[PDB]
């Protein structure tokens, strides 16, 4: 667990969500993926 904006079998930082379960962290940031930084 480290390339969080790669491609991943997931959705990376850099890319759209879904559901928290789209993004590779587990955190739908407003419809976006992101790191431990949902604050915005």
Known sequence: ???FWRGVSLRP???SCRDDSECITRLC???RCSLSVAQE
Do not use: F
């Open 1 to 3: 667990m480290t390339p």
């Open 13 to 15: 930082i850099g890319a």
């Open 29 to 31: 940031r407003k419809r």
